[PDB]
Design a protein around this ligand. Structure first.
Ligand code: IVS
Length: 329
């Protein structure tokens, strides 16, 4: 194991967290390793908002490495907003450290109910410098320059609650994680880890859709129209005015997603995008699929996808490698 690993843990059998510390002294926090954002923030010991009570807070004054900044920042997410200011200090991910620029959050009110209801402290962006606010170079990129890692690539082997933990491998591809050949898809832009694939479900086809590989999205995002046409003769129930879709987990009409490029095709069948809703009702399932439209027809291949496919994120080669993850390490 010549490359920097980071154990991931199952969170409510849907999301997952990993740990990393700030300051020359440990000061550990629990993060959501989000390839869908390019900023690293953390709850400041100075936070006054209620959502911070349950969290681990950052004490800049107890770190010889701290380096004041103060320019205020506002991290905007589809799910919430966070306030604070920039500060700099030694960020330790796995067994590697580097003076990094991050946000010391002090107001978390615009990130509820999520934040208070969740176990993570902050979010660690794994996207591209252009997705970042305050133009910060990706962490993995810095590490490469500083010859801390061979190549600027990070790997994701999502965990499974009781089967195995997961891993965020840095600077190296380990076959332990996947079986079969890796297939690379070049990024259509250096923003999100976005590639171009053809989105085919049943009789429905969306050519060259923009597919975003996001470890920070617990669901599978699909453009609204595509989703509607998709659920037509399916016997799925969308509770009125709610993004809540219920089915018999056994519903034999449920389709398998099919994303194809010239190098390969990736499918995501029912067993992967269905969430059990037993307590609601016996043999009942929800879709864990969301209707979401972007300026350009986009699919967010979130956790559900990554849980099935081991993924490689290459900065140096600007592409994403995909391969079937081992059913078990
Ligand atoms: C630079 C901004 O980056 C982004 O806007 C996307 C981030 O990756 C962000 C993660 C940060 C918010 C951490 N993702 C989301 O906001 C997504 N939210 C979720 O996946 C949440 N899941 C649900 O609410 C469940 C439904 C989808 C069923 C999850 C955070 C709990 C949305 C795009 C869907």
């Amino acid at each position: 194991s010549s490359n920097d690993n980071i154990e991931l843990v199952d969170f409510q059998n849907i999301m997952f967290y990993g740990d990393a510390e700030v300051g020359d002294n440990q000061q550990p926090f629990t993060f959501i390793l989000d390839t869908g954002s390019a900023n690293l923030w953390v709850p400041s010991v100075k936070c006054t908002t209620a959502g911070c009570l349950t969290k681990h807070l950052y004490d800049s004054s107890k770190s010889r490495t701290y380096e004041k900044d103060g320019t205020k920042v506002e991290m905007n997410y589809v799910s919430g907003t966070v306030s604070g200011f920039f500060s700099k200090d030694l960020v330790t991910v796995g067994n590697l450290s580097l003076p990094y620029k991050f946000i010391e959050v002090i107001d978390t009110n615009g990130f509820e109910p999520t934040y208070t209801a969740s176990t993570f402290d902050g979010i660690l962006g794994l996207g591209w410098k252009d997705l970042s606010i305050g133009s910060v170079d990706p962490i993995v990129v810095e590490l490469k320059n500083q010859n801390k890692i061979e190549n600027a690539l990070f790997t994701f082997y999502l965990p499974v609650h009781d089967k195995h933990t997961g891993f965020l491998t840095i600077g190296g591809i380990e076959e332990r994680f996947y079986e079969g050949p890796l297939t690379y898809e070049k990024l259509n832009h250096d923003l999100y880890w976005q590639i171009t694939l053809d989105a085919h479900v049943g009789n429905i086809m969306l050519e060259k859709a923009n597919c975003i590989v996001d470890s920070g999205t617990s669901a599978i995002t699909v453009p609204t129209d595509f989703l509607n046409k998709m659920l037509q003769n399916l016997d799925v129930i969308k509770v009125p005015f709610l993004p809540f879709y219920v089915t018999l987990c056994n519903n034999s009409k449920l389709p398998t997603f099919e994303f194809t490029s010239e190098n390969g095709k990736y499918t995501l069948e029912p067993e992967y995008y269905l969430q059990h809703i037993e307590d609601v009702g016996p043999g009942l399932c929800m879709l864990n699929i969301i209707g979401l439209d972007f300026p350009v027809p986009t699919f967010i291949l979130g956790d559900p996808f990554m849980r099935k496919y081991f993924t490689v994120f290459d900065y140096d080669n600007h592409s994403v490698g995909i391969a079937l993850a081992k059913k078990n390490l």
